[PDB]
A paper describes a structure:
To understand the nature of the interface between the R1 domain from MTA1 and RBBP4 we co-expressed and purified a complex between MTA1-R1 (residues 464–546) and full-length RBBP4. The interface between MTA1-R1 and RBBP4 is extensive with a buried surface area of 2,837 Å2. MTA1 interacts on the side of the WD40 beta-propeller domain making interactions in three adjacent grooves. The contacts made by MTA1 on the surface of RBBP4 can be rationalised into three regions hereafter termed interaction regions A, B and C. The interaction region A of MTA1 takes the form of an extended strand followed by a short helix (H1). Comparison of this structure with that of the equivalent region of the R1 domain (region B in the description above) shows a highly similar mode of binding to RBBP4. However, given that the extensive interface between RBBP4 and the R1 domain of MTA1 (and by inference the R2 domain) occludes the binding site for histone H4, we would predict that RBBP4 is no longer able to bind histone H4 in the NuRD complex.
The nucleosome remodelling and deacetylase (NuRD) complex is one of at least five corepressor complexes that recruits and activates class I histone deacetylase (HDACs) enzymes and directs their activity to chromatin. Metastasis-associated protein 1 (MTA1) (and its closely related homologues MTA2 and 3) are up-regulated in various cancer tissues. They serve as scaffold proteins for the assembly of the NuRD complex. RBBP4 and RBBP7 are WD40 domain proteins with a characteristic seven bladed β-propeller structure.
Residue numbers in the entry:
A (entry chain B): 468 to 518, 529 to 546
B (entry chain A): 10 to 89, 103 to 163, 166 to 175, 180 to 211, 214 to 411
Write the structure that this text describes.
């Protein structure tokens, strides 16, 4: 088909964090076949240049039995 | 269909352009033949004065006419003002060892105690064992297995008790071999467990308990077995797990009680060994059958799954029952963390990288292998 490489640069890494509202990683993670606005975050990241705990498995099993099927 | 394949090819281009925003690592590589198996070997070499490290895989081939091979391939994973760091993979993914295999490799797994030893499932009842140090890395253009073990895709080495191997036989039974201290090339079964009524699909040892092992089959059941019990015709427990054929299972590495099972009813079911009557959770979202499911080695609340659909979903069960917006409800449930749309065909198998967190290798029926890591900002906040 077409082999390729991707090591994401550290400018793109924090560009996602700075432009969280435009990117929407929570939305984009489950929508791989929606084209992301690649122009908008690149404009806002350059324009706005100058500037987690997981909760254990004991808690989620306790939640699952507390809120059952 | 000529229309559908065109719609797949466009969606691959959409995905490919999104990869800097959805991933930190993507490494596509077209194999000569499509692999039905994939597993990371536990070792990692850190070469002197470089910005990468050599991890290794255990791949196979699925071919009718040409000679099949047990493959081992190296992979270069990087160590720790321009956008989109695209390059070109060349000399990063390469084949180290090729060994001749009799028939197609439906599954291949390394022995936890001695990673040099690899068992391989066949379409027939038997399981062939190979030691890749014993064989030459350059095969001539004749299979030569170290042990043949007579008796679905199920295969599992026991992490405790070296040399104990399980597999799903062709006659609705689960074989059990003991290859430690063989006096003789051929080996026969120690035990044959006859519980299931239909074709057994997958079988897995329990991680902390030498005697415990689970199994799944086309008869819609999850059977938790005990090798110490004399009655081989009936298991310790038996659940009606799903509404269709159950194709896979996997125990949680951070909890002795928890496990997951995938099935042809488009759902991964979460279970607890302390109560097999209650089903803890049913992960709904997948658009076709589930054939594989794996827990993350690093994170207890993370598991991934794949199957007949070209997408591989990653589940974060720490987000179960979180307050979403109504826009996020359309996307899916909150426990669904990430969807991987890199493949354009049925994902046969995948495997989490044991050394580097969040790196997964997946293979598919369109000849391609993808080593990838999802974006840092998705899993961390």
């Amino acid at each position: 088909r077409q082999a390729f490489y991707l090591h994401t640069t550290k400018l793109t890494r924090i560009a996602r964090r700075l432009c969280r509202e435009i990117l929407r990683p929570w939305h984009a993670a489950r929508h791989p076949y929606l084209p992301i606005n690649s122009a908008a975050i690149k404009a806002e990241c350059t324009a706005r240049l100058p500037e987690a705990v997981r909760k254990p498995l004991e808690a989620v099993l306790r939640y699952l039995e507390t809120h059952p099927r | 269909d000529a229309v559908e394949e065109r719609v797949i090819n466009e969606e691959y281009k959409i995905w490919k352009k999104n990869t800097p925003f959805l991933y930190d690592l993507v490494m596509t590589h077209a194999l000569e033949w499509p692999s039905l198996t994939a597993q990371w070997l536990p070792d990692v070499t850190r070469p002197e004065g470089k910005d990468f490290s050599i991890h290794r895989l255990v791949l196979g081939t699925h071919t009718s006419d040409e000679q099949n091979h047990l493959v081992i391939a190296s992979v270069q994973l990087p160590n720790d003002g321009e956008f989109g760091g695209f390059g070109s993979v060349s000399g990063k993914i390469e084949i180290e060892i090729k060994i001749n295999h009799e028939g197609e490799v439906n599954r291949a797994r390394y022995m936890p105690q001695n990673p040099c030893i690899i068992a391989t499932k066949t379409p027939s009842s038997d399981v062939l064992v190979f030691d890749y140090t014993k064989h030459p890395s350059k095969p001539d253009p004749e299979c030569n297995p170290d042990l043949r073990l007579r008796g679905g895709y199920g295969l599992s080495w026991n992490p405790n008790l070296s040399g104990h191997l399980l597999s799903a036989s062709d006659d609705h039974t689960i074989c059990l071999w003991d290859i430690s201290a063989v006096p003789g090339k051929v080996v026969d079964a120690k035990t044959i467990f006859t519980g299931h009524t239909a074709v057994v699909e997958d079988v897995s040892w329990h991680l902390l308990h030498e005697s415990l092992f689970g199994s799944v089959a086309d008869d819609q059941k999850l059977m938790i077995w005990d090798t110490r019990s004399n009655n081989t015709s009936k298991p310790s427990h038996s659940v009606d797990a799903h509404t269709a054929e159950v194709n896979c299972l996997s125990f949680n590495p951070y909890s002795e009680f928890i496990l997951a099972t995938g099935s042809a009813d488009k759902t991964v079911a979460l279970w607890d060994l302390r109560n097999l009557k209650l089903k803890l959770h049913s992960f709904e979202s997948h658009k076709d059958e589930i054939f594989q499911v794996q827990w993350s080695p690093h994170n207890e609340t993370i598991l991934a799954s794949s199957g007949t659909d070209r997408r591989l979903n990653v589940w974060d069960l720490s987000k179960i029952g979180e307050e979403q917006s109504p826009e996020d409800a359309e996307d899916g449930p909150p426990e669904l963390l990430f969807i991987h749309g890199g493949h354009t065909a049925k994902i046969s198998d995948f495997s989490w990288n044991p050394n580097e967190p969040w790196v997964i290798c997946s293979v598919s029926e369109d000849n391609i292998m993808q080593v990838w890591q999802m974006a840092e900002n998705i899993y961390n906040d």
